[PDB]
From a paper:
AlkB family of 2-oxoglutarate (2OG or α-KG)-dependent oxygenases are evolutionarily conserved and implicated in nucleotide demethylation. Mouse [name] protein has 389 residues and consists of an N-terminal extension (NTE), a nucleotide-recognition lid (NRL), and a C-terminal double-stranded β helix (DSBH) domain. By establishing a reliable in vitro enzymatic assay, we demonstrated that [name] prefers bubbled and bulged DNAs, instead of ssDNA or dsDNA substrates. Structural studies of [name] in substrate-free and a 21-mer bulge DNA-bound state revealed the molecular determinants underlying the observed substrate preference, including unique features of a stretch-out Flip1 motif and a functionally indispensable N-terminal “α1” helix.
To obtain a stable and homogenous complex sample for crystallization, we adopted a disulfide cross-linking strategy by introducing a cysteine residue (S235C) in the catalytic pocket and a disulfide-modified cytosine within the bulge. The overall structure of DNA-bound and the free state [name] superimposed well (r.m.s.dCα = 0.555 Å), except for conformational adjustments of several flexible loops of Flip2 and Flip1 regions. As expected, the structurally stabilized Flip1 element remains in a “stretch-out” conformation even in the presence of DNA substrate, lending further supports to the lack of autonomous base-flipping capability of [name]. Consistent with our previous analysis, the 21-mer bulged DNA substrate is docked onto a wide and positively charged concave surface in between Flip1, Flip2 and α1 (left). The bulged DNA adopts a B-form structure with both strands contributing to enzyme-substrate recognition primarily through “basic-backbone” interactions. Notably, two arginine residues (R24 of α1 and R159 of Flip1) insert into DNA minor grooves from both ends and function as two fingers to hold the DNA substrate (right). Such a recognition mode likely helps to orientate the DNA substrate for proper insertion of the flipped base into the active pocket, which is supported by dramatic activity loss of the R24A and R159A mutants. The observed interaction mode between [name] and bulged DNA underscores the need of both the flanking duplex/stem region and the flipped base for recognition and catalysis. Our co-crystal structural studies demonstrated that the stretch-out conformation of a K/R-rich Flip1 creates a wide and basic concave surface best for duplex DNA engagement with the flipped methyl base inserted into the active center.
Numbering used by the authors: 20 to 354
Write the structure that this text describes.
DNA sequence: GCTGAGTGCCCGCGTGCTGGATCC
DNA sequence: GGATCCAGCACGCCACTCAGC
């Protein structure tokens, strides 16, 4: 009956050693072999627009040249593209830091604003920094503001009653994330994409994202972009109806998902954040050094050792997700 | 659409314990 | 040794969604 619920519980209660992860698709070592199962659907290669993004535009936002990306889809899931980590070595750190220290501060609205004010809310980063100096990090203490951060809205905010977006309490969308999103969208064949509504989600090792569909009336020709940084996770992509058996796949640090049309209508969930392997506190793609020569225009710049130390201690047991949508038609504003 | 069961949307709240950590 | 603390859990409740009619 309720196949998605049962598999969601299965992968949630997965403790590496308890449950079998053999059916979870790893796009980093993609099969491409013709039907090497059921029940897993076939993985197909997705041709990219290699010439649509200049290597300099890709480097300014930390991405490899589009000629080097490998993208895949799944048979039966039109509109779903999975791009394993296309970032240049060391470039995920800048976007992680943007999520942790920059995008978390005002005017952006977070969960922390529900029962607090901009008092220490603006001092989230300084609080974590002070925690790291005092070595009070193993010491017993109340959870920091950074550790209590769960989500952040960017750009237009969604109305759960209207099922529509509006300009009420609009906060400006970050232009650098918009540029990165536009590069990814153009590379996937979506011309004229404008990042306008964003969600940042911060997950602990026991965090989950339940089964849900997106029901808002939007232009389904436009892509939705989903970036993941930090610890790996398992992602479940289901069907139009909640009781269809989903397909499981890994989300490694730097992986990007692009969803359009049909696949935007499907049930999906994130049942589990996997703990890091032994002796691999962080993914290899997060410790690599930045390229020596950076473009003078580059939006990715090396950050403080203090800032990255905060980021690394946080990401040791966390996953960060960025979700980006276009909600307004090309040209038209919000009247 | 209605209604009881099921989880906690970019939905949680308040309160009383408690037992491991902390302090000297 | 021993007094003290308090972060987090359990719990009951509210918020909101889902499923079966
Ligand atoms: Cl959507
Ligand atoms: Cl489609």
């Amino acid at each position: 009956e309720d196949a998605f619920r049962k598999l969601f519980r299965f992968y949630r209660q997965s403790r590496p050693g308890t449950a079998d992860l053999g059916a979870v698709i790893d796009f980093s070592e993609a099969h491409l072999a013709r039907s090497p199962k059921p029940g897993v659907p076939q993985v197909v290669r997705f041709p990219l627009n290699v010439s649509s993004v200049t290597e300099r535009d890709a480097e300014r936002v930390g991405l490899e040249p589009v000629s080097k990306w490998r993208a895949y889809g799944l048979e039966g899931y039109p509109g779903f593209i999975f791009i394993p980590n296309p970032f240049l070595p060391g470039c995920q750190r800048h976007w992680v830091k943007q999520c942790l220290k920059l995008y978390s501060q005002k005017p952006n609205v977070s969960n922390l604003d529900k029962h607090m004010t901009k008092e220490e809310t603006q001092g989230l980063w300084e609080q974590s920094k002070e925690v790291l100096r005092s070595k009070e990090v193993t010491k017993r203490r109340p959870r920091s503001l950074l550790e209590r951060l769960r989500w952040v809205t960017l750009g237009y905010h969604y109305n759960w009653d209207s099922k529509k977006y509006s300009a009420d309490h609009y906060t400006p969308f970050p232009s650098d994330l918009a540029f990165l999103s536009e590069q990814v969208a153009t590379a996937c064949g979506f011309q004229g994409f404008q990042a306008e509504a964003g969600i940042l989600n911060y997950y602990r090792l026991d965090s989950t994202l339940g089964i849900h569909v997106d029901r808002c009336e939007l232009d389904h020709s436009k892509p939705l972009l989903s970036f993941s940084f930090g610890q790996s996770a398992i992602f479940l992509l289901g069907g139009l109806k909640r009781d269809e058996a989903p397909t499981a796949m890994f989300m490694h640090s730097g992986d990007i998902m692009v969803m359009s049309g049909f696949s935007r209508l499907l049930n999906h969930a994130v049942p589990r954040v996997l703990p890091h392997p032994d002796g691999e506190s962080l993914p290899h793609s997060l410790e690599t050094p930045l390229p020596a020569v950076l473009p003078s225009n580059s939006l990715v710049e090396p950050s403080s050792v203090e800032d990255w130390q905060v980021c690394a201690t946080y990401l040791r047991t966390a996953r960060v997700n960025m979700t980006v949508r276009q909600v307004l038609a090309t040209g038209q504003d919000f009247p």
